[PDB]
Amino acid sequence: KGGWFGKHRGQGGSNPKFENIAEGLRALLARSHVERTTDEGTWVAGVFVYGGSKTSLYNLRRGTALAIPQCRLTPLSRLPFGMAPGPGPQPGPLRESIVCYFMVFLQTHIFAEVLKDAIKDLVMTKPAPTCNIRVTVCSFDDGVDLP
Amino acid sequence: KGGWFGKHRGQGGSNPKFENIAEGLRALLARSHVERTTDEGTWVAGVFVYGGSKTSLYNLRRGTALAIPQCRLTPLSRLPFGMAPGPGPQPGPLRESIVCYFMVFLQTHIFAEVLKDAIKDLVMTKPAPTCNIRVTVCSFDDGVDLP
DNA sequence: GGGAAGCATATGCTTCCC
DNA sequence: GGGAAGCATATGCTTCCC
């Protein structure tokens, strides 16, 4: 258990655990066959996913990759803190919490709203920490030119 | 040169290098003296910064921290690839590039729009790779509940 | 101020346990 | 399908180069 297997960052493949999550997402995405890709091929919309636990978000990230060939995903990363309570001292902009997040890039705003409804639906019937994963649609004013 | 200096992730302080960057950002933001915080204190918008090179983005990130105590910053992370041209297969949603990004969370959409302009203005006068840094405003439909 | 060094420690990945 | 182990290699952070 543990160690190196020869698979680098971003090289994760599929296994039954991730595929089960993918099949759950696919059944949910299938409630709305909306357009996922455009002629322009621009990444103008997204979905910001955060919370739950490190493993529950990681697992969601892996399953989404299998469920949607048309999206592009970031590695997991960390969120900074919000507003501290009171007229007291605020945390510095750079301070990081233990809470993770990841971003999903999509070509349409309509598909982004669908993915977001799928993730919230898939997670609402699960026990903590999974049920505590949060999601929001993100509109990029100028789009993101992914390399 | 190199090694441990007792400063953990998110603990960066200030030094003339980052203060110099901060001062340039400050002078630009001062022409547009808008509100940076709301009373509901919710994080509803952001500035998605990317490209350039790992160091120039990092330095911009540290300077932004000093210039804006009212914002919040994620660590640097990596961007997936985009669309391949042609009828063939596309890269997997998880594949990562060497290209970095970071996100600035803000309380108002007006201030994100102003912050974006200032960053584009700061960077456009400089040599490569810094002038290659890209910026876009991000609107969070349901906001982001920072820890 | 961009780039490199280099410790501490972050995630990406897999396989195993429950 | 959540949590952990544990190698490889990511960034955070500094000081020094230049």
Side-chain angles (χ1 to χ4, degrees), chain A residues 73 93 96 136 138 141 145, chain B residues 9 73 93 134 137-138 142 145:
Chain A
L73 296 147
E96 66 171 45
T136 187
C138 202
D141 291 26
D145 293 301
Chain B
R9 294 163 58 88
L73 304 156
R134 301 290 301 281
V137 172
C138 213
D142 306 311
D145 285 280

Side-chain angles (χ1 to χ4, degrees), chain A residues 56-74:
Chain A
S56 66
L57 258 198
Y58 180 79
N59 289 351
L60 181 54
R61 174 181 161 272
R62 298 291 306 268
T64 301
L66 297 176
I68 313 167
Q70 303 86 18
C71 80
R72 295 303 180 266
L73 296 147
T74 61

Side-chain angles (χ1 to χ4, degrees), chain A residues 81-142:
Chain A
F81 297 92
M83 287 301 276
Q90 291 306 330
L94 304 172
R95 292 255 195 34
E96 66 171 45
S97 65
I98 298 298
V99 183
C100 294
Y101 80 88
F102 68 90
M103 254 275 210
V104 186
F105 299 87
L106 305 155
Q107 296 192 174
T108 74
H109 177 96
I110 314 291
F111 188 44
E113 183 102 43
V114 167
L115 208 212
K116 183 217 69 192
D117 288 333
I119 290 173
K120 290 292 197 164
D121 287 358
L122 181 282
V123 120
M124 71 169 252
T125 64
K126 308 206 163 195
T130 304
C131 66
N132 303 327
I133 290 176
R134 306 289 297 294
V135 197
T136 187
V137 171
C138 202
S139 312
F140 294 96
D141 291 26
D142 323 293

Side-chain angles (χ1 to χ4, degrees), chain B residues 40-79:
Chain B
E40 55 277 350
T42 44
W43 311 86
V44 293
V47 179
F48 189 90
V49 185
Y50 65 102
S53 72
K54 188 183 184 196
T55 314
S56 62
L57 244 204
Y58 183 74
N59 294 346
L60 178 61
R61 175 181 163 266
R62 296 289 302 274
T64 294
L66 298 173
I68 316 163
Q70 303 80 13
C71 74
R72 293 305 185 268
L73 304 156
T74 64
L76 249 51
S77 195
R78 290 168 161 201
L79 248 49

